[PDB]
Amino acid sequence: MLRKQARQRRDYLYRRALLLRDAEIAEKRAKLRAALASGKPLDPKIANDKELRKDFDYDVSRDIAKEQGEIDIDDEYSELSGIVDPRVLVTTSRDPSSRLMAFSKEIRLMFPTAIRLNRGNLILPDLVMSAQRERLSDIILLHEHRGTPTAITISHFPHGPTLMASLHNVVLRADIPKSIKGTVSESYPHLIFEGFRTPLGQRVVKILKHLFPPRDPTNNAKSGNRVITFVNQDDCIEVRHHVYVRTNYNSVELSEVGPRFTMRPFSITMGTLENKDADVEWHLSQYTRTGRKKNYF
Amino acid sequence: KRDLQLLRMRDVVAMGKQFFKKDNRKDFVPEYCQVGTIIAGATDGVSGRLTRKERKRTIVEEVLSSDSVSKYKRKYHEIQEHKKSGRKGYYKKLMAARKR
Amino acid sequence: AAERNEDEFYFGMMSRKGPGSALTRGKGFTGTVDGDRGNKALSVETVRLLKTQD
Amino acid sequence: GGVTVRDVDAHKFVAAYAAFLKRQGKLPVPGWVDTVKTGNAKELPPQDIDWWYIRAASVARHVYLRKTVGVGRLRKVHGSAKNRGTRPSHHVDASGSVDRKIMQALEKIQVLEKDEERGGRRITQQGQRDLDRIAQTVAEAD
Amino acid sequence: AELVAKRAWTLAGEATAADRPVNSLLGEDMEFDHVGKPVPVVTEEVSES
Amino acid sequence: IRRAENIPTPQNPNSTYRKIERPERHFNPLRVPKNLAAELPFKSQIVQT
RNA sequence: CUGCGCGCGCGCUACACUGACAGAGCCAGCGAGUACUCCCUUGGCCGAGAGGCCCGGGUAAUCUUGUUAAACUCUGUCGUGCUGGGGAUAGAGCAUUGCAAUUAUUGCUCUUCAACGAGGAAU
């Protein structure tokens, strides 16, 4: 099994590098197809390449399929997108506190298909090993400061990305009394994402919305009574968890049911939780000059 | 072999007073050699003739019997100071001055 | 070290001593494969010759 | 048959040797014995009262079983946990006056020797001789 | 006398913690650079939006 | 003022520029850990006599 | 005492007999460690201890370090008594870090010996 995970990760990295070179060529091939249909004259370096024309005659059709959106990009999520229900386990750090364990339970209840695991004495490579051995889609690690959580680590499996984020303004479910709160409904939640516009924003949108099981698309625009909101300002994604009734065709009553975060991501690594030496995709550039001026996501 | 190492280092032997053609092959030992001795020029025999206490066996023995061996030692000790400049006795001294 | 085939077979493994483990080697365990210093176990006739010379 | 001390279990050996060093009457005892603690990491002094023989036997066997050992290793060996009261336990070295004086005592009795050739203290050849002899004696009681 | 007297610790360029009095920074009004983005505090307009 | 009322100019010996004797920086060699050096494969195993 | 908005939260240590103490057995694993330097430190003395001192190995699977770690195991002492459970508070002394230790940095010794007898409702 382990040889298959290593081999498939190496094949994925090689295919991504080949896609970089092929994109450098296919930016030139899309000018030849647009000039053929519209008749505007093109560059001589493009029109006088015999290899480009000879291979263009075979590779028209994938460019047309990408224009129509009929195919999907080579990704770690596009293999099993809406086919499998992504199972995900939430774990603490090594010796958790009682409020960290209740918070772990609360963000377990945020996902309708998640499970929680007691860490105890569990070495982190064997944690990764057991996740790949039970075909989990995601793990989420939690770190507390003193009864208040300060970091999440959302890792996609078998070889997918980590998003490590630091938590702020955490208001737990376990602070309000049982007369006012209650047992959270476990229905498949709607999701809304607000303010993600860069390709890095669509990356974090993908690795956050593939944590939830896929919604049945027959009548999802009106059915379902539970929503989860990820909205970012100043690249600190703030998340709420509401439950709603549609009290009229023009009005809706919301009710806050879950914990509130404003998590800020500081590391997105193309590689799982065990790989400390995985190649990072983005990291929070503090101690640079304009790293506080520039806004990502 | 000492004589051939001396012949490839004969620029260093005459310390800048006489520079030589930079012939630097990978192997300094040629395939065919023969160690000989200058006999005599019949026109010059008062100062172009090494005495009995200077006709030595090898070439390295002649270099060592010559002068400026103190000059070689002076240049070697300057190189040794420049190469012991900051390596590890320096860091042992810094660590001792911190620990005191 | 991560992407290492556990069944690899070079033919220097029949003429080298492996890095072993701390249990098999002992207190003198570094992960470095030990090399030869050039010495060899010397037969009795040649040591008879050398000791006659000494 | 032939014998070492490695053929005899720890406690009955060290007790046999303790009873022998005691009986012998040659030993030096410093004098600050009884009024001393063994370590800063301890609460009470030893309960045997005359007990320097127990550590002398334990030291001498420890040295027999290896090349060379110094005062620092013995302090580290004979030390244990100190309760820092209400703050976590930590390991703490034992006293180097005890062990160094034991070594000097057993040196003057010719059962161990200085080893400046490598450092520390080595078992004496006469220490091998007497230790192997009492180790035999222990197995002869059994 | 002011020109000949010793400079104040604010007018010396390098003020280590031995020169000045104890809590003497609280009485000063200096500007300095900060590092990194602060975290946005959740205010009622943010939760309403 | 200083020449009249006889006070020397303030001079700091830590402030006066000096020549700095820099030894050549030599660093230690690489120190590979024992478990990594025993786990890495045969073609890249470390050979130390 | 951090944090959140005398009150609050995370904690450490206990109320002992599956124990405290004193000998004695004696067993890990992830680490780190000194160049233009004083880091990790064995051993030898001195010291009750903390520590001091003389040397020493290591830029390290090579030396510290088998990190002889702690619960733990054994043979003793104590005997249910706030008891030798507990070790707060406090006096006096000796040391180490540091330019500096008063509002007591930390370390050791003697002495002082508080609450706490399993935590209530709840959650």
Swiss-Prot record, chain C:
Component of the ribosomal small subunit (SSU) processome composed of at least 40 protein subunits and snoRNA U3. Interacts with snoRNA U3. This is U3 small nucleolar RNA-associated protein 11. One of its GO terms (biological process) is rRNA processing. Keywords: Nucleus, Ribonucleoprotein, Ribosome biogenesis, rRNA processing. The gene is UTP11. Involved in nucleolar processing of pre-18S ribosomal RNA. GO terms for cellular component: nucleolus; small-subunit processome. It is found in: Nucleus, Nucleolus. Belongs to the UTP11 family. Its main location: nucleus.
